[PDB]
Amino acid sequence: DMLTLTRYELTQLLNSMLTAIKAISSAVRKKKLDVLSNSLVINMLQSSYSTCVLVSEENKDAIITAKEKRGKYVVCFDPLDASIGTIFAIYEKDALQCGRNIVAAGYALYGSATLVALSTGQGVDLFMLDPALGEFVLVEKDVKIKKKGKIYSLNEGYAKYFDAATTEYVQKKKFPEDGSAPYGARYVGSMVADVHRTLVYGGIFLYPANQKSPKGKLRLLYECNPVAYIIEQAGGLATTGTQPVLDVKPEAIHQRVPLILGSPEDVQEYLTCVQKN
Amino acid sequence: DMLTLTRYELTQLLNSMLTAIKAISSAVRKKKLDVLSNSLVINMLQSSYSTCVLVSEENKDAIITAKEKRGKYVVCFDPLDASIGTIFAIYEKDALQCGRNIVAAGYALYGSATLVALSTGQGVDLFMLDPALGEFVLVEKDVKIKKKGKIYSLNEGYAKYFDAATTEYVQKKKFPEDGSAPYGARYVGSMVADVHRTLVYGGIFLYPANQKSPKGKLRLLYECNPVAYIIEQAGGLATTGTQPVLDVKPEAIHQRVPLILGSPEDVQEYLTCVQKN
Amino acid sequence: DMLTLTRYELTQLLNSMLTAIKAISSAVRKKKLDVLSNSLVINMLQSSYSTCVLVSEENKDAIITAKEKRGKYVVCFDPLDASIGTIFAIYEKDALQCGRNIVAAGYALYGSATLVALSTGQGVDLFMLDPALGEFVLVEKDVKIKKKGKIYSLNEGYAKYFDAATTEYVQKKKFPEDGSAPYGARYVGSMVADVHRTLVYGGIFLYPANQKSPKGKLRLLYECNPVAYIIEQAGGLATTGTQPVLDVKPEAIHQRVPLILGSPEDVQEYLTCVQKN
Amino acid sequence: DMLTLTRYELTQLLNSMLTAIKAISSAVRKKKLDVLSNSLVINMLQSSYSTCVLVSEENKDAIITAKEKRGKYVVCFDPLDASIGTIFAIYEKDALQCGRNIVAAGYALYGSATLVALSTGQGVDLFMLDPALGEFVLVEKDVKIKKKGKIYSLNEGYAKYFDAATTEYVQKKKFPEDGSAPYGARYVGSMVADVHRTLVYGGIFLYPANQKSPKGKLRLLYECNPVAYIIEQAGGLATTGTQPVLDVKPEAIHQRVPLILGSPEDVQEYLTCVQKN
Ligand SMILES: O=P(O)(O)OC[C@H]1O[C@](O)(COP(=O)(O)O)[C@@H](O)[C@@H]1O
Ligand SMILES: O=P(O)(O)OC[C@H]1O[C@](O)(COP(=O)(O)O)[C@@H](O)[C@@H]1O
Ligand SMILES: O=P(O)(O)OC[C@H]1O[C@](O)(COP(=O)(O)O)[C@@H](O)[C@@H]1O
Ligand SMILES: O=P(O)(O)OC[C@H]1O[C@](O)(COP(=O)(O)O)[C@@H](O)[C@@H]1O
């Protein structure tokens, strides 16, 4: 029952992102939150003396920071996503980058504990906020996702709007010809929560195109790219159905794309259902 | 930014249940938990000088308490159910009672905040644990569930095992002939979490009979009856598909039953799909 | 084990002071603090849209706030005072007011619990910070100090520098001619902590003139006046040895005065030792 | 803002003592406490399967534990000592040992943070309770006390009852013939708090014999011996005025002794004032 604590440009920027995430967590323990969480990030990011361009889910246009505070990196984030979360990728022209230029990204999930999944390009680490210390404690290094899972995760209430491939794929999960058990279904309906289950327990998560939202719903710059980056770094795949999420070339900051991600073999089975349609 | 706090046999028993729930919450903030949470309840219930018979999800046989500590009430509970929870109904012969003899019941959900839904027969109150005070704060009196919702909630991965009625019902939710929007689907896969969403946001939750578990999975005495009691007290319905959960006559302490509950009109539409099969 | 919470220009200003005190408490749970605590107050006070002039223990000159945010009240404070604290009185010409013009004042003591003693002119209330809620909970209304105590409190290590009256008075406390027990001595050496013991348990507290500091040490505007106001509102006295602290006319913002306060009969015995010298 | 945590018979016993201290801390954050804290220690010590004999400040007679749980060590403790604390020394015949047979001892101080000073014979470590983790974090290894300080600490309100040596010594602190500054005086009046200041900042602390309590007040087995052990391990001295505290041979479990401890040169100056009287 005794412990020692040890510490573990870009670096200051992530400190401030983590600090904002600390702030956000406590406000949640208690729509007025969107505004509040948004301003926490921006300000804490602005005053980390290390950003030039910011993209928020909450702001129509990108937020260019004052030259005195200006820095090198660009940050696209969703300040606030039942367990909700925060999403960010560190990279206006300078904000429309393809996901494969990400230097750092992560998310936070605000449950009983505040967890942060984080990667700077050499894997994924999981942190648990220690609110007494006001510091993030490493709980798992280099998290790897299962090659294949036994869970599938989408809003099946959109069945009537599904494209052929999604319909075929869900059919296979429920009626495996093979004579393997059907997958279990889980869908919390908060993307950080569903993605995070997928990372940790394995399987696949889907918010694809459908009749209602033919480009999908989830946002490229600060939802899909970020979790795509985390998932790939964890040994998984993230696709739109036609190309890896991280390879999309953004043509607007608030652009939407389809998101399919998870265990690589599960995503690869989904892609087989696409080629064949 | 200034507040005053005010207070708000059976009564001591619920105090101790709440205290055990306090204890359990903190252990969770951190399988070894099942054993630990179980023993917390039992002991705190035993030493409330007010129980005679206990039924735990964790113990094969009922736990008869020593005469010096013995009391009037009987407690059936699930110490530990991603947001997990604790479930209990206050009522061995004396433990096999039909749900309609419940004097008190509730659950706890351990998320960012520990919430307790509680009823003693005159409605449902929602409490939020204040871990600084070690006390439960009332956040909503007499919670009522929507007459009808727009959410349905089950493991659709069991489709291949569904009975005709469940299959028909899910079909209607996704393809409303009517020309109303399809319901949204949510399934966390933890029963306290799914039930609680259902209470608060409305709709229906299902873990019915299927080929695999023809009696269902969920346990009558300390899962289904308790949440059935909470849901009815909130203006909803809870059925097995053939009779209200609370009217089942238990023929074993660890008996399983099907559970369908939620907004009353949603449960009543499900029941229509049964009569017709 | 169940509770209900109830709420309990000038008003927004105190909210923000309390919020800054919330912020300060958490930073303490962990010299770099002086700067940090100071800036928290100023900013949170500035952006309460209700101040015009501020005086900090940390700033040589008074801090005039921008007209867009400007308001009616003036605040003199010590952001940071072993249990330390925060001190403030709500009232540059406009900052040099005699203590009897105070509209509101209080202190915070950062121990196991963060306590705030607060008065707006109709007594003293004691609050305990609930860090989960981020709100202050009333624990005692209209605190009254004992008419007479059994504790005296000063740095007796300054004996060699004491004036005649202080020496005579300490002699009486230790060798009561009367044949009453000697007072007990307590001296934490943090003024908020010593004052607060004095308020609650009774007795007297002294930091008088001496050879070293002939004007005393403690600061008029944001140490002595504030606690003088709290103590008088609690039925006590606060004197410099020649006039009530609150009646001094400040001739500089960082002016020092002698402070003697406590139970009124104890302060009145001290004053008798002065007249007679 | 990122950290890794690392771990750091006798050993299980100290775990349980620390656990009881965890429990006690939280009850304090909120006379009924004496009983509660006492029972926490005893039970957590009893069920560490490692004690045979216990001595509490709260129990007239020693508490012999049941053979099934019995173990090797004997524990003398004060469950509860404004910042209060817990004191314990690990060693009925088997309970009357001279302090120099101590295998382990420490104290806890319950302030803004719960600190534990701990020694197993190879120095003193300081720990800070992390209440989120429920674990104690090392903040300083092998704490050493100053050779000489500038603080003296006793209830000078007992002056009329002082023996010649104490009176002479206090005179020297206030009127240093030498032409060095007088010591500062601090006296919180809680022994854990006063001792702890003394360890960390340096100087001397005294609760000697006087006319009222000619054997002193503080208790040998679970107040004086424990802090004497901590202080010596930190490079200081602890004396009764005639022999080191740890060398006293107890003739009763609730025996009292005089306590003088601190920086070794300060204690040695006090002892010079004794030989000379
Ligand atoms: O349409 P659904 O199935 O309810 O999906 C909800 C999705 O929208 C979100 O709530 C976020 O919405 P936005 O894309 O507008 O930010 C995700 O958390 C989640 O995956
Ligand atoms: O079979 P599924 O869809 O995974 O359902 C899981 C169900 O089992 C539970 O996890 C509890 O299981 P038990 O009935 O064995 O206690 C519920 O929380 C949940 O509703
Ligand atoms: O000279 P002493 O006896 O050490 O007194 C210390 C005093 O100084 C303080 O620490 C604050 O000092 P300042 O007046 O400079 O702010 C008070 O808390 C305390 O009463
Ligand atoms: O007589 P004083 O000066 O008030 O001393 C109080 C002393 O008594 C204590 O409060 C504890 O008393 P006990 O010895 O009876 O346990 C110590 O913390 C403190 O040193």
Same domain, yes or no, for D134 and D179? no
What is the Cα Rg of chain D in Å?
19
Same domain, yes or no, for A163 and A73? no
Domain end, chosen from B114, B143, B172, is at B143
Count of helix runs (H) and strand runs (E) in chain B: 6, 14
**DSSP designation for B260:** E
Q: Do C186 and D185 touch (CB under 8 A)?
A: no
Q: How far apart are CA B141 and CA D172, in angstroms?
A: 68
DSSP-derived pairing of the beta strands C104-110 and C84-90: antiparallel
DSSP-derived pairing of the beta strands B151-153 and B125-130: unpaired
Q: Which residues of B are annotated as a binding site?
A: 9-11, 57, 72-73, 78, 80-81, 155-158, 187-191, 207, 217, 223
Burial C153-178 (b: 16+ CB within 10 A, else e): bbbbbbbebbbebbebbbebbbeeee
Show which residues on chain B lie within 8 Å of chain A, measured between beta carbons: 28-29, 82-83, 110-113, 152, 155-160, 173-175, 182-189, 197
**DSSP designation for C133:** T
Same domain, yes or no, for B91 and B179? no
The Cα diameter of chain A in Å comes to 64
Residue nearest to atom 14 of ligand 1 (CA): A218
Q: Do A132 and D132 touch (CB under 8 A)?
A: yes
Query: Of A252, A244, A26, which Cα lies nearest the Cα of A130?
Result: A26
Same domain, yes or no, for A125 and A47? yes
For residue B258, what is the enclosing H or E element? none
Q: In sequence order, what are the residues at sequence separation of 6 or more whose Cβ sits closer than 8 angstroms to the Cβ of residue D45?
A: D13, D16, D17, D20, D51, D54, D75
Chain C residue with Cα closest to D29: C112
For residue D109, what is the enclosing H or E element? strand D104-110
Same domain, yes or no, for C136 and C152? no
Question: How many domains, chain C?
Answer: 2
Chain B residue with Cα closest to D25: B132
Residues with CB under 6 A from ligand 2: A 184; B 57, 81, 155, 189-191, 207, 217-219, 223
Query: Of C193, C259, C188, which Cα lies nearest the Cα of C221?
Result: C259
State the nearest Cα–Cα gap between D134 and chain B, in angstroms: 8
Burial A211-233 (b: 16+ CB within 10 A, else e): eeeeebbbbbbbbbbbbbbbbbb
Map tokens 């917390």 to a residue. B40
Query: Of C126, C137, C269, which Cα lies nearest the Cα of C199?
Result: C126
Residue nearest to atom 6 of ligand 3 (CA): C189
Same domain, yes or no, for B150 and B121? no
Residues B256, B260, B264: CA angle, nearest 5 degrees? 145
Burial D10-26 (b: 16+ CB within 10 A, else e): eeebbbbbbbbbbbbbb
Secondary structure of chain A as H, E, C letters: CEEEEEECCHHHHHHHHHHHHHHHHHHHHCCHHHHHHHHHHHHHHHCCCCEEEEEECCCCCCEECCCCCECCEEEEEECCCCCEEEEEEECCHHHCCCHHHCCEEEEEEECCCEEEEEECCCCCEEEEEECCCCEEEEEECCCCCCCCCCEEECCHHHHHHECHHHHHHHHHHHCCCCCCCCCEECECCCHHHHHHHHHHHCCEEEECCECCCCCCCCEHHHHHHHHHHHHHHCCCEEECCCCEHHHCCCCCCCCECCEEEECHHHHHHHHHHHHCC
State the nearest Cα–Cα gap between D68 and chain B, in angstroms: 20
Residues C100, C21, C258: CA angle, nearest 5 degrees? 40
Q: How far apart are CA D126 and CA D113, in angstroms?
A: 12
Q: Do B2 and C19 touch (CB under 8 A)?
A: no
Q: How far apart are CA B182 and CA C203, in angstroms?
A: 73
Same domain, yes or no, for C117 and C187? no
Q: How far apart are CA C238 and CA C261, in angstroms?
A: 4
Q: Can you say how many angstroms the Cα of residue B35 is from the centroid of all Cα atoms in its chain?
A: 20
Polymer length in residues for chain A: 277
Same domain, yes or no, for D175 and D132? no
Backbone angles phi, psi at D207, to 5 degrees: -140, 80
Same domain, yes or no, for B133 and B210? no
Q: What is the CATH number of the domain that holds D269?
A: 3.40.190.80
**DSSP designation for B191:** H
Q: How far apart are CA C22 and CA A146, in angstroms?
A: 44
Q: Do C82 and D157 touch (CB under 8 A)?
A: no
Residue A151 exposure: Cα atoms within 13 Å on the Cβ side: 26
Q: Where are the beta strands (DSSP E) in chain B?
A: 2-7, 51-56, 63-64, 70-78, 84-90, 104-110, 114-119, 125-130, 135-140, 151-153, 184-185, 204-207, 237-239, 259-262
**D206, β-bridge pairs:** D260
Same domain, yes or no, for C201 and C109? no
Same domain, yes or no, for D128 and D249? no
Q: Do A18 and D1 touch (CB under 8 A)?
A: yes
Chain B residue with Cα closest to A184: B157
Output the CA A57–ligand 2 centroid distance in Å: 36
DSSP string for residues in D157-203: GGGGGB-HHHHHHHHHHHS-TTSPPPPEE-B-S-HHHHHHHHHHH--
Inter-axis angle of helices D164-174 and D264-275, to 10 degrees?
A: 130
Resolution (A): 2.3
Q: Which two tokens stand for residue B99?
A: 């749900």
Cβ–Cβ contacts within 10 Å for residue C19, how many?
Answer: 18
**A88, β-bridge pairs:** A77, A106
Output the CA A191–ligand 1 centroid distance in Å: 6
Query: Of C242, C195, C185, C249, which Cα lies nearest the Cα of C223?
Result: C195
Domain end, chosen from B96, B111, B143, is at B143
Polymer length in residues for chain C: 277
Burial C77-109 (b: 16+ CB within 10 A, else e): bbbbbbbbbbbbbbbeeebbbbbeebbbbbbbb
Output the CA C41–ligand 3 centroid distance in Å: 21
Q: Which chains touch B (3 or more CB pairs under 8 A)?
A: A, C, D
**D116, β-bridge pairs:** D108, D127
Query: Of D138, D109, D125, which Cα lies nearest the Cα of D6?
Result: D138
Q: What is the CATH number of the domain that holds D137?
A: 3.30.540.10
Question: What letter represents residue D72's amino acid?
Answer: K
**Is the torsion defined by CA of B221, B226, B228, B229 positive or negative?**
positive
For residue D237, what is the enclosing H or E element? strand D237-239
Residues B94, B98, B103: CA angle, nearest 5 degrees? 75
**DSSP designation for D223:** I
Q: Which two tokens stand for residue D239?
A: 């004396």
Domain end, chosen from A97, A116, A143, is at A143
State the nearest Cα–Cα gap between D256 and chain B, in angstroms: 37
**DSSP designation for D66:** P
Cβ–Cβ contacts within 10 Å for residue A2, how many?
Answer: 18
Residue nearest to atom 14 of ligand 2 (CA): B218
Q: How far apart are CA C20 and CA B16, in angstroms?
A: 37
Map tokens 């919390």 to a residue. A188
Query: Of B123, B153, B110, B93, which Cα lies nearest the Cα of B20?
Result: B110
DSSP 3-state of D47: coil
Range of the domain at B272: 144-277
**Cβ atoms D218, D209 nearer than 8 A:** no
Report the side by side order of strands in the sheet with C204-207.
C184-185, C151-153, C204-207, C259-262, C237-239
Cβ–Cβ contacts within 10 Å for residue D181, how many?
Answer: 11
Q: Can you say how many angstroms the Cα of residue B225 is from the centroid of all Cα atoms in its chain?
A: 7
Q: In sequence order, what are the residues at sequence separation of 6 or more whose Cβ sits closer than 8 angstroms to the Cβ of residue C39?
A: none
**Cβ atoms C92, C105 nearer than 8 A:** no
Q: Is D31 exposed, middle or buried (0-12, 13-18, 19+ CB in 10 A)?
A: exposed
**Cβ atoms B263, B153 nearer than 8 A:** no
Chain A residue with Cα closest to B109: A112
Q: Where are the beta strands (DSSP E) in C121-275?
A: 125-130, 135-140, 151-153, 184-185, 204-207, 237-239, 259-262
Burial A109-135 (b: 16+ CB within 10 A, else e): bbbbbbbbbbbbeeebbbbbbbbbbbb
Same domain, yes or no, for B85 and B155? no
Of B2, B7, B19, the CB nearest to C3: B7
From the CB of D157, is ligand 4 less than 6 Å away?
A: no
Of C110, C152, C159, the CB nearest to D112: C110
Q: How far apart are CA C61 and CA C253, in angstroms?
A: 8
Output the CA C191–ligand 3 centroid distance in Å: 6
DSSP-derived pairing of the beta strands B151-153 and B204-207: parallel
